[PDB]
Swiss-Prot record, chains A, B:
Membrane topology recorded in Swiss-Prot or TrEMBL: Peripheral membrane protein
PTM per Swiss-Prot/TrEMBL: Phosphorylated at Ser-65 by PINK1 during mitophagy. Phosphorylated ubiquitin specifically binds and activates parkin (PRKN), triggering mitophagy. Phosphorylation does not affect E1-mediated E2 charging of ubiquitin but affects discharging of E2 enzymes to form polyubiquitin chains. It also affects deubiquitination by deubiquitinase enzymes such as USP30.
Site, Essential for function: residue positions: 68
Effect listed in the UniProt record for changing residue 60 to R: Decreases affinity for UBE2R2 in CRL2(FEM1C)-UBE2R2 complex
Source organism per UniProt: Homo sapiens (Human)
Function: Exists either covalently attached to another protein, or free (unanchored). When covalently bound, it is conjugated to target proteins via an isopeptide bond either as a monomer (monoubiquitin), a polymer linked via different Lys residues of the ubiquitin (polyubiquitin chains) or a linear polymer linked via the initiator Met of the ubiquitin (linear polyubiquitin chains).
Site label Interacts with activating enzyme, positions: 54, 72
Gene symbol of the encoding locus: UBC
Full protein segment contained here: 1 to 72 of 685
Residues carrying (Microbial infection) ADP-ribosylthreonine: 66
Protein name: Ubiquitin
Length: 72, 72
């Protein structure tokens, strides 16, 4: 399924993922596309910070869901 | 001719270029000055993303023009 990630600068990125994909895997996909190291990235969905040891399905993230990316 | 590049942190860099210089060449000049690899840099002018296979003259960039640098 496709998901969207918005940046602090107003950019939107589209990613192809599976509900069984891990958050760490998602961060890795972002690194590949934007060059941002996973340790400097924070992912938020519906006001909650997503953990690297959990999956998309655990957060009930559905197709065309939009995640927010924060930089540290 | 001289041009200006602004960073996301509010820094302004001055570069010496020729209208026949390529965007890839411009990125290379930025790498030399800031240490940012060309693959992690995105250049925007008048709202348009500049391509690595095109030249400054193609975008009608004139002396004292200001470009915007984005990081990925």
């Amino acid at each position: 399924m496709q998901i969207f990630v918005k940046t602090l600068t107003g950019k939107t990125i589209t990613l192809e993922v599976e509900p069984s994909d891990t958050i760490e895997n998602v961060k890795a996909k972002i690194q590949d596309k934007e060059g941002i190291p996973p340790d400097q990235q924070r992912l938020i969905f519906a006001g909650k910070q997503l953990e690297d040891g959990r999956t998309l399905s655990d957060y009930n993230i559905q197709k065309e869901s939009t995640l927010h990316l924060v930089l540290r």
